[model samples]
Target chain A: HTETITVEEGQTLTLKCVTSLRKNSSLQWLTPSGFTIFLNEYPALKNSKYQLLHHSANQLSITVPNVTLQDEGVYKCLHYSDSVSTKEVKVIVLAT
Target chain B: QNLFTKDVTVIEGEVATISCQVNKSDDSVIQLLNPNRQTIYFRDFRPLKDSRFQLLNFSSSELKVSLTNVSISDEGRYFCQLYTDPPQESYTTITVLVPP
Candidate 1:
């Protein structure tokens, strides 16, 4: 199923992909560059440079502070714990 | 004398020996590591396994590395590493030439 809509260039985007998962669960972002990042844990963008805010146990919020042309591709959020798991929002960043 | 050397070129399908010389005692073990950072092969410088790879001789200061029925893919950097707490590595890169 299509969980996320595509975002055009030069636009401020906030992805609200929600789920109903268990506690002690964690979230991560799978990038196209074969790199993986946990929420609020980027080496370059940590401490509020690029924001990945958690609204609830199952809702994840990602905000791009400044959208650039290089930020173009699909992004995936994977939620998993020891017992249960869910994946949502494969986002597409369109170049203008 | 913890130095290593080997035949720079080996013909495909021919057997060759890649030698490792060290200053350690005979009780010390020599290890070989692959490019993917895995110990895919090794011996005690004596015929230990089958005909594929043979350790020709074992001594306190000399260790012979031999490979049989060599192929093109066998061309790689073979490492003669001393298994210390922080592992010392010496490398010998071998190139295999295919005979037409």
Candidate 2:
């Protein structure tokens, strides 16, 4: 389902998409604002707010800098493998 | 923030145009994702494989997509994304109003 995560405005929002890998499989992320960061990498967009972090064994993480009220929305993490697995994180920002 | 409506309503058999407010100075690439989360438009190659979609404009301050002859199958979310400051992220869930 979806998990609600509240964060203070003007701070950073962190997200992680973790899943075990298989042949021809990848971890994908879709922002609530609807930006799909490609398979385990950063998108080639002009916005530097979205940053991709290094993954360890089975976790891929992302960070969005200087989040505001407009950034409050859902973020989806999916495992693109032989099976269908997914998770959602909803963001709510506290007004400053 | 009260920006734009997230839901857009359209009548069956009518056309729907989804536009995003962006500047020409922004990134040259703009992509549109359909209800199925498929890339209907990617830069100039656009719509990838769908014939019902067309890129109307992207040379100006706004980027647009025209979907002709709307159907129930088109009743879902659509996203128009570009890379810009504050992020040019426009998403609308189009609801087809089927007349009885």
Candidate 3:
């Protein structure tokens, strides 16, 4: 399913994700600039502007605080359970 | 014997589809690097985690990735390099412009 969200600049935004894949389930946030944000662990991602919060059994929420113009684009929530499944959320950050 | 090159232009909020075609059939790792040559995406002919950047189609001679929602930050030269013996290489300059 596709989701679209519009938020003002410098606001906190959260992309909701829910899945049924338990074991071996991997979560990834695909940024607009082609970078992959690993929900489990990120050793190379030095950016502190993004956070993965409320990671429950199947619910994974990615919070991008103080969203900027560079954050505008399609934020894809990819879940790899037994197979790869995707949920896309289009984020539009309005200019202040 | 590698002759792969492409140029693409996309307005803001659009999708940019970049592709690479290899001349030979073999096991090779395809990587996408930014203008600064930093690896953004890499696939060893296996399952990738990213959703926006996907191996839309993979064959012995072809590889592709679709970047959704074109933005100014997404603009610039992108390198589609094949990590093979002698390393086949190509470059695609993507110009992402704001919509009028």
Candidate 4:
């Protein structure tokens, strides 16, 4: 439900978010800005800097290349299933 | 830090004010989420069409908003999130007192 991650500026960072059950719906990733950076497979906004990894239904996460202070914040992942659940990861970026 | 705001109680037709203040503010994004977990404003990107939602202030480390003509439909918690370095989160509940 809550976690923390620290990554230095310009370094690659990955946030972890996994579900217990196979998702009945598409996974989501919301930035602290409240923007749906990663929509539920609809009009997906996949980009090079941001990569969403789906090793399996149980493992849903994101990787940020050359992460920076602008990307430091709580990254939330929401998936519909037995219940509407959300996972949060607070990324702390250390300045160089 | 405790970024929580005071719970607001008002008559069904009255106005409810919700405030959020953080310790540090930067280029970080701040947002407001209503009772239904809908984003009212995401740091100036307000896609919400409700005219009743009044944004009183959004400056520095604090953000404030008021809901006009409050109703039982709006009786619930509102989330204020500051996506700063530490990332602050708080909630303010709106209590609507219905008439007999």
Model 3 agreement with the true structure over B1-100: per-residue lDDT tens digits: 4536589998888888887767765645565655654454555332333355555776666667788877788788988766554555678999988787
Residue-level lDDT of model 3, residues A31-51, one tens digit each, is 665555444443123434678
**lDDT tens readout by residue for model 4, A1-96:** 488988999999876676676634445677776555544432123233677655456666667888878999887877655445678888899999
- For candidate 1, lDDT tens digit of each residue in B24-57? 5443445554332233233342212234776677
lDDT of 1 at B36: 27
Model 2 has an lDDT value of 0.67
User: Which portions of model 4 miss their true places by more than 4 Å?
Assistant: A1-96
Which ranking of candidates, highest TM-score first?
4, 2, 3, 1
Best by lDDT: 4
C-alpha RMSD by candidate, in order: 15.1, 6.9, 12.9, 9.3
Clashes of 3: 0
Off by over 4 Å in 2: A55-57, B1-34, B38-100
- The lDDT of each candidate is 0.55, 0.67, 0.67, 0.69
Q: Name the runs in model 3 displaced over 4 angstroms.
A: B1-100
Measured with C-alpha atoms, the lDDT of residue A77 in candidate 4 is 78
- Give candidate 2's total backbone clashes: 1
User: lDDT tens digits, residues A10-91, model 2?
Assistant: 9998887667756555565677755666444546345457788755436778888898898888888766454446788888
Model 4, B1-100: lDDT tens per residue? 6355778888998888888776645545567778756566665544355779888888766678888988899999898876544456688888899854
> Candidate 1 docking: what grade?
incorrect
